[PDB]
Design a protein around this ligand. Structure first.
Ligand SMILES: Nc1ncnc2c1ncn2[C@@H]1O[C@H](COP(=O)(O)OP(=O)(O)O)[C@@H](O)[C@H]1O
Ligand SMILES: Nc1ncnc2c1ncn2[C@@H]1O[C@H](COP(=O)(O)OP(=O)(O)O)[C@@H](O)[C@H]1O
Ligand SMILES: Nc1ncnc2c1ncn2[C@@H]1O[C@H](COP(=O)(O)OP(=O)(O)O)[C@@H](O)[C@H]1O
Ligand SMILES: [Mg+2]
Ligand SMILES: [Mg+2]
Ligand SMILES: [Mg+2]
Lengths: 534, 529, 520
């Protein structure tokens, strides 16, 4: 009509309802994968490629979403996975529920600015209330706190019942890769634990490697496959017949030089390898290649050479064993040497046969402790889901060790926040009051979803929860009731701090902040212009 | 070597689109799977907590109901074994009127347990033997499970308490009202003789108000208007004609042959004088209401208005016959005045407006007659059709009680007692028949299991409670739907009862359908035309 | 290998199916929301033929929408049922049903058993219905001036949403006179409604008599007179023209004298019919059947009026007004069967010629003659008057009045909140949701008016809990007011049936757990 834009235009309640519908779609995809009673999903990639998963971030990454207001929630799950590593489903569910209730208010003609102000206020005060009333110090709780946090993260995953053992593995691995640097602050750099998958023996047969596990093998079958007092040389250059560089040409005018030039092309690499081996290096890892001519030198020396190793694996082996990755055998004296100080050490390096394949294990490195985990399941689907679940658990333990605060699970925090914020809304305005009440009510979608998935009376259970938390917030003698949440194996509230259902505070805090940011961004939209492609 | 050829013989001689299945795998198990899928489609509608379904048929007509036979009819069942189970369900509807969902559930359960037994290593023959012997034992047992009897079908409170159960599974929220209405109607049309006809209960669905505004009418209602000027009559003297309200003409071609101006001038006056004489003879017999099954002529209508006769035109012949039964009249094929016996009577005949609809009411004041009508009010045609189905259930229950007055406890009590007793019989029966007897017994558990699942509680605890109470000795105990947690109570003391004949026929038909499906071994479908 | 159902069977099952049913109902409600109340708007729908219908009437709008959703068809059906049983409340019923569904949507998503929800709906419906019957105002005087005032106020309320709201006192007085001159059955076929394009709403009129459009006159009709000052009226079902005395009649003559006798005999048959009609004293003649040119000219020469092919409904109205009987035979034309009026006239009304029988004191009939600038203008005027007429009939039969502007909904919402705060706690939430749903009527009034429904609903909730039961939305002041004193009156049966139908529809929709579409 009057507007001549070459595209479609949605405006008002139409586009607001559409945005809420999209967000709801995304949240209803993942609601069934929440909590110890949540279930996994198959995803088929249009070719028969199968992916089993409970991770909401993984699900929303694999999906092909068309609506931008739904792409927002997918990116929200991705961001939660990047910054926390857990909560990727809860954050999406909460963002969608905030969107739903806020759009209900906007339909009642509460201005979206007022809804947004109220949501921001409620988010700030919920974060404050958590930090002030709902946290437990992991110092007061010990190491069983880390084990309980790992087991809580592993509930809802395919390493759930085996959590009793997988949590020990995760905790040992994070403590192994613990390192303190300058500024003397303790750092737990997960993604430095290596995770390999090998279908075969049961899950209980999964292994924690004190050392490092390399998805590589020796370069020659004549080389040994076990070395005990391993002197390790990590090289970032290739060991091949030397070729003159691009700006260098051989032009012979005296045939008598051809033989010596051709022989030099190999003697150069021979000399480099002899220099490396003269120091005692019996294990040589390389990011580059190793010609057969060179592999023969390693074979005759009785050394173990490995080629095409990955840069990150090499960096980790070097840091763990005490070695220095060399891009060149070149010193500050204009010569070529290899010092025995550039070597690393390990009490054993072996080529181990896992299932029908082989990998290399570097065991008991000195100058640092390292950790690898070989997951063992029934097929690649199980192994990939175990890898994802274990990554979640490692991230959770990392957060618990970095910030020493945890909160109870099972909807305890959400029930407490619902109570406290529905009481707190009474003080702030009249429409921001409704917005804060709706934020509070939205927070209840987590215990509601937990109970629904547990196939229990969500209404009764969440009412009992809220009653407990109201008693806790109105009777100062019963403040220990804060720790009550859902027991989804029996459909009855329970002291989750004593049951061991713990979450890192950062999980809930970041979930709330990100969900609020997403809800505000989606609620700010009152128009949509979709241009026809060209 | 990249193609498997059809084997020589039947595989090659088979037509293009024809299919042939043979053996336990291709035929027996696929039939059992189909019947299981059917039972699953209708399981969630069983019982008072049973949910309705919104079926749209190929004609885009909408059915909102939890009546199993209706759902099956409006579904396009295409698997032949499922068709056979549906035939069993429809035979149950024909014989009894209620229990079709029992038939489906029980048949599906028998077939699933039969598949399990075939997998453990029994032969279809042994399974069938055990199922038949166990059906015989169930029929031997049920008479002993009969708890109460009607003891009076001329009362209105007892009949309501008896019909409430059948009209509770359908229309759970409002069942006291409906049982009252259906009891009033059934005992109005119940004659001194023990014979009861269900077609004599008429149902008029009028849009407007709601199910609580429904009523019973000792008489008849027709969504018609009156042809003439008279609209009400207080001491009806009804005269009924299957012929039109016009001058009789020849069945052979008639021609008015005029040959003189006098004949031409007098023919039409003679016709009207004839009509006036006919209608005046009818009026002078005392008739104030005339009901014609054919058309009405303008001159005859003129003279009926002149002589103050209410004219009614009923297109249908079933409607005409039922009106005759109502008023005590005889449909005359000639326009001759009726004799004192051929005439019908009604304490009132009037035109009213129920809602937007105009209706002609032949209403007796006495609390009896040969025909009664239930005027169903409701805010939706679909709702009124579902309530009509519930009315049909109540009326068919009344007829089943006129045939056999015996009653068994509901809510799964009889099913649990049957399961227990047949299990005790199979534990004594040696030979491979005991497996099939015990599975036939365990199939009964599907009924309280379906009730519990729909009530919204755990069927295993419900069934364990029932088994424990029936072991302690209470055969009238069944599950309580008015309990959020698994519970049980005295079905007799609660008034939740089923019909001995209903259970008898449902068990018989379900067993027969399952046994036929099992007796099938090869299937040769033709190309779907 | 072999499938249970026919290929193409679409089955939607479970909580998603139920939530989708509720959402479709929300769509259907949205389609009529903005028509509610004095600030309500009209909808323009167009058919495949390109013919447009313009209406504020919710039943009409939903009939025109080609709704196919099985659950959303239920709202259309209950709007039809409301228009049938009452004639008003069609938008309110749909809004209420959709709001019940919306209010229980969260619990449905959170796994609340539909049986529990329907039990709560039934309970709250019975409570609200009994409460309406309890607090409904029934003046126990049976006074005629006050009962005409009451009907007039209920009609003005029923008309305060249409395009004739600026003439609603006019049209309400006319509707009340119309339904008060009817017989006991209050038949709608006894009120005629003519639509004469051209003219203003205030130029519309009611004739205490009967009126119908001129009907295919032959030659000599202009030679006839067009005004009679005490005519007797012959109402007939008689074809007055030279015709085959019968279709299966065959004349056979063998003589020219007999031939001429037969010709003259046809003419004498006709002339004798006409001469009897003339000797009955009737100066006006109406036939449901044609009146030929010969009869037309005969009556013109006798200075009589004749009209043939008159429609059956107009004939019956003329009968009920003038006081005669319709005759298939002209052989007994007594003064008992002849009709009578004080004036008969043929006048021009906006391009058409209309015959008016006016002055009938024994008239149990009236004819509305509606003017306006468009076919759809006049059609929506007719629909508005139909609303008012049905309201007035129901009020005549049961003068039990409640107040509008959302007063009754706020009173029932308060009462049901009170009741819900006294019950275990599962039904508590659901009956409170019922109560919160009842507030959709004043909320939608304020929305369509352009107010802040939030502040107005706060004011109303406060004033209904302080004591006061007829406080509702005041539209012209953007405030609240005692609507029973402001005379925003509504027969109680309107809202009774609205709640009944809405609750039944909601219970049905919530009881459906599976939808199975067979392929066509
Ligand atoms: N043992 C448990 N009992 C009750 N609730 C639990 C338990 N373990 C985890 N939860 C809850 O499950 C919810 C979500 O878990 P999950 O879906 O695995 O991860 P996320 O949603 O954080 O991606 C959290 O609210 C958590 O508190
Ligand atoms: N109030 C009640 N409590 C428990 N069970 C009931 C109740 N009312 C009916 N039933 C049970 O519901 C079953 C019949 O439900 P229905 O869906 O009509 O199946 P059918 O089509 O086989 O009659 C019977 O087992 C009957 O005992
Ligand atoms: N003058 C008025 N002021 C406030 N509210 C009114 C007024 N007139 C009618 N209403 C309310 O508007 C609603 C009816 O609007 P309308 O769309 O005409 O009727 P319905 O939708 O019920 O067919 C009722 O709640 C009625 O009480
Ligand atoms: Mg998690
Ligand atoms: Mg039944
Ligand atoms: Mg209205």
């Amino acid at each position: 009509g009057p507007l001549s834009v070459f595209g479609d235009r949605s405006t008002g309640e139409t586009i607001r309802s559409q945005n809420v519908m999209a967000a709801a779609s995304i949240a209803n995809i993942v609601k069934s994968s929440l909590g110890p009673v949540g279930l996994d999903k198959m995803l088929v990639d249009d070719i028969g490629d199968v992916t089993i998963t409970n991770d909401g971030a993984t699900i929303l990454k694999l999906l092909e979403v068309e609506h931008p207001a739904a792409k927002v929630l997918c990116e929200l799950a991705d961001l939660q996975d990047k910054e926390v590593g857990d909560g990727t489903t809860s954050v999406v569910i909460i963002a969608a529920e905030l969107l739903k209730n806020a759009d209900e208010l906007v339909k009642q003609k509460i201005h979206p600015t007022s809804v947004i102000s109220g949501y921001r206020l409620a988010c700030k005060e919920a974060v404050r209330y958590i930090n002030e009333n709902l946290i437990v110090n992991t110092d007061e709780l010990g190491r069983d706190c880390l084990i309980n946090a790992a087991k809580t993260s592993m509930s809802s995953k395919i390493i759930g019942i085996n959590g009793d053992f997988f949590a020990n593995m995760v905790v040992d691995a994070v403590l192994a890769i613990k390192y303190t640097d300058i500024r003397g602050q303790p750092r737990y750099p997960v993604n430095s634990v290596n995770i390999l998958k090998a279908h075969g023996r049961s899950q209980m047969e999964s292994m924690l490697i004190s050392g490092y596990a390399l998805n590589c093998v020796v370069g020659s079958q004549g080389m040994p496959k076990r070395i005990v007092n391993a002197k390790i040389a990590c090289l970032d250059f290739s060991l091949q017949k030397t070729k003159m560089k691009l700006g260098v040409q051989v032009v012979i005018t005296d045939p008598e030089k051809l033989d010596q030039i051709r022989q030099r092309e190999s003697d150069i690499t021979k000399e480099r390898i002899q220099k490396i081996l003269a120091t005692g290096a019996n294990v040589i890892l390389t990011t580059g290649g190793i010609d057969d001519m060179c592999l023969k030198y390693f074979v005759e020396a009785g050394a173990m050479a490995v080629r095409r190793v990955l840069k990150r694996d090499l960096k980790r082996i070097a840091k763990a064993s005490g070695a220095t990755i060399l891009s060149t055998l070149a010193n500050l004296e204009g010569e070529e040497t290899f010092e025995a100080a550039m070597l690393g050490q390990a009490e054993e390096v072996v080529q181990e046969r896992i299932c029908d394949d082989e990998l290399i294990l570097i065991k008991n490195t000195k100058a640092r402790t390292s950790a690898s985990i070989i997951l063992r399941g029934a097929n690649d689907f199980m192994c990939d889901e175990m890898e994802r679940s274990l990554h979640d658990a490692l991230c959770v333990v990392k957060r618990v060790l970095e910030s020493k605060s945890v909160v109870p699970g099972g909807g305890a925090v959400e029930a407490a926040l619902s109570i406290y914020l529905e009481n707190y809304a009474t003080s702030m305005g009249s429409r921001e009051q409704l917005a804060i009440a709706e934020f509070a009510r939205s927070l209840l979608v987590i215990p509601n979803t937990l109970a629904v998935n547990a196939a229990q009376d969500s209404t009764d259970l969440v009412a009992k929860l809220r009653a407990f938390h109201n008693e806790a917030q109105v009777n100062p003698e019963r403040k220990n009731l804060k720790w009550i949440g859902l027991d989804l194996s029996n459909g009855k509230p329970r002291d989750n701090k004593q049951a061991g259902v713990f979450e890192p505070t950062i999980v809930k805090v970041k979930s709330l902040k990100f969900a609020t940011e997403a809800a505000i961004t989606i609620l700010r939209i009152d128009d949509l212009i979709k241009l026809h492609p060209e | 070597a990249l193609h498997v050829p059809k084997a020589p013989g039947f595989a090659q001689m088979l037509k293009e689109g024809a299919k042939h299945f043979s053996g336990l795998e291709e035929a027996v198990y696929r039939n059992i799977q189909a019947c299981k899928e059917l039972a699953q489609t209708t399981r969630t509608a069983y019982g008072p907590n049973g949910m309705n379904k919104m079926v749209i048929n190929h004609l885009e007509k909408l059915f909102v109901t939890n009546d199993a036979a209706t759902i099956l009819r409006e579904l396009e069942v295409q698997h032949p074994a499922a068709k056979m189970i549906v035939m069993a369900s429809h035979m149950q509807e024909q014989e009894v009127g209620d229990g079709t969902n029992f038939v489906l559930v029980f048949a599906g359960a028998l077939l699933e347990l039969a598949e399990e037994l075939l997998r453990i290593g029994l032969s279809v023959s042994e399974v069938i033997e055990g199922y038949e012997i166990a059906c015989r034992k169930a029929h031997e047992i049920l008479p002993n499970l009969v708890c109460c009897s009607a003891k009076n079908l001329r009362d209105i409170d007892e009949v309501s308490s008896l019909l409430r159960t059948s009209i509770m599974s359908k229309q759970y929220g409002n069942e006291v009202f409906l049982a009252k209405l259906i009891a009033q109607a059934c005992v109005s049309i119940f004659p001194d003789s023990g014979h009861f006809n269900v077609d004599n209960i008429r149902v008029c669905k009028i849009l407007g108000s709601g199910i609580s505004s429904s009523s019973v009418l000792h008489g008849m209602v027709f969504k018609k208007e009156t042809e003439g000027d008279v609209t009400s009559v207080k001491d009806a003297k009804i005269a009924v004609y299957s012929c039109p309200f016009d001058g009789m003409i020849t069945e052979t071609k008639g021609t008015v042959l005029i040959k003189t101006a006098e004949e031409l001038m007098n023919f039409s006056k003679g016709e009207e004088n004839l009509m006036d004489a006919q209608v005046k003879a009818i009026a002078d017999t005392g008739a104030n209401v005339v009901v014609t099954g054919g058309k009405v002529a303008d001159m005859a209508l003129h003279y009926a208005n002149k002589y103050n006769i209410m004219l009614v035109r009923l297109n249908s012949k079933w409607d005409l016959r039922r009106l005759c039964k109502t008023v005590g009249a005889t449909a005359l094929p000639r326009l001759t005045p009726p004799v004192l016996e051929e005439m019908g009577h009604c304490d009132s005949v009037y035109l009213s407006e129920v809602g937007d609809t105009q209706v002609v009411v032949f209403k007796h004041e006495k609390e009896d007659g040969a025909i009664s009508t239930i005027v169903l009010r409701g805010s939706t045609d679909n709702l009124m059709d579902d309530i009509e189905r519930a009315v049909d259930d109540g009326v068919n229950t009344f007829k089943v009680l006129t045939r056999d007055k015996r009653l068994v406890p509901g809510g799964g009590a009889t099913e649990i007692e049957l399961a227990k007793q047949i299990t005790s019989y199979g534990e004594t029966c040696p030979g491979l028949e005991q497996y099939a007897i015990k599975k036939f017994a365990e199939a009964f558990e599907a009924i309280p299991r379906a009730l519990a699942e729909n009530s919204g509680v755990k069927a295993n605890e419900v069934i364990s409670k029932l088994y424990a109470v029936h072991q302690e000795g209470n055969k009238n105990v069944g599950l309580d739907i008015e309990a959020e947690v698994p519970a049980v109570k005295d079905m007799l003391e609660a008034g939740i009862l089923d019909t001995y004949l209903g259970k008898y026929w449902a068990i018989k038909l379900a067993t027969n359908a399952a046994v036929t499906v099992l007796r099938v071994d090869q299937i040769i479908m033709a190309k779907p035309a | 290998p072999v499938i249970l159902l026919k290929e193409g069977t679409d089955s939607s099952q479970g909580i998603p199916q139920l939530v989708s049913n509720i959402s479709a109902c929300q769509v259907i409600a949205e389609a009529v929301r903005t028509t509610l109340g004095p600030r309500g708007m009209d909808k323009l729908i167009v058919d495949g033929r390109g013919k447009a219908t313009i209406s504020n009437d919710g039943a009409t709008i939903l009939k025109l929408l080609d709704v196919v959703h099985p659950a959303a068809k239920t709202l259309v059906d209950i709007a039809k049922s409301q228009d049938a049983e009452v004639g008003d409340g069609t938008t309110s019923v749909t809004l209420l049903a959709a709001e019940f569904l919306k209010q229980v949507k969260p619990y449905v998503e959170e796994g609340l058993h539909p049986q529990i929800i329907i039990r709560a709906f039934r309970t709250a419906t019975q409570l609200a219905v009994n409460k309406i019957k309890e607090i409904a105002v029934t003046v126990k005087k049976a006074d005629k001036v006050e009962q005409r005032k009451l009907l007039e106020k209920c009609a003005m309320t029923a008309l305060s949403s249409k395009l004739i709201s600026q003439q609603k006192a006019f049209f309400a007085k006319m509707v009340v006179d119309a339904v008060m001159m009817l017989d006991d059955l209050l038949q709608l076929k006894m009120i005629g409604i003519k639509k004469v394009q051209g003219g203003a709403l205030e130029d519309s009129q009611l004739v205490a008599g009967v009126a119908f459009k001129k009907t295919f006159s032959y030659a000599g009709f202009e030679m006839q007179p067009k005004k009679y000052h005490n005519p007797k009226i012959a109402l007939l079902n008689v074809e007055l023209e030279l015709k085959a005395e019968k279709d299966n009649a065959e004349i056979r003559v063998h003589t020219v004298e007999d031939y001429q006798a037969i010709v003259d005999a046809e003419w004498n048959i006709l002339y004798d019919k006409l001469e009897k009609i003339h000797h009955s004293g009737a100066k006006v003649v109406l036939s449901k059947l044609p009146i030929g040119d010969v009869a037309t000219q005969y009556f013109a020469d006798r200075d009589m009026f004749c009209a043939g092919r008159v429609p059956e409904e107009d004939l019956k109205r003329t009968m009920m007004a003038c006081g005669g009987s319709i005759q298939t035979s002209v052989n007994a034309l007594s003064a008992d069967v002849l009709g009578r009026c004080q004036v008969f006239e043929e006048t021009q009304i906006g391009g058409e010629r209309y015959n008016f029988f006016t002055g009938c004191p024994k008239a149990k009939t009236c004819t509305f003659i509606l003017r306006g600038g468009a076919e759809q203008f006049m059609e929506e005027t007719e629909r508005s008057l139909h609303d008012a007429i049905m309201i007035v009939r129901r009020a005549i039969k049961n003068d039990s009045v409640v107040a509008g502007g959302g007063a009754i909904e706020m009173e029932l919402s308060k009462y049901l909140r009170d009741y819900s705060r006294t019950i275990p706690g599962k039904q508590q939430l659901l009956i409170g949701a019922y109560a919160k749903a009842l507030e959709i009527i004043p909320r939608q009034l304020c929305d369509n008016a352009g107010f802040d429904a939030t502040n107005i609903l706060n004011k109303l909730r406060a004033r209904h809990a302080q004591g006061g039961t007829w406080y509702g939305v005041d539209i012209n002041n953007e405030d609240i007011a005692d609507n029973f004193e402001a005379f925003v009156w509504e027969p109680a049966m309107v809202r009774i049936n609205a709640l009944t139908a809405a609750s039944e529809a909601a219970c049905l929709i919530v009881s459906v757990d599976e939808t199975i579409k067979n392929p066509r």
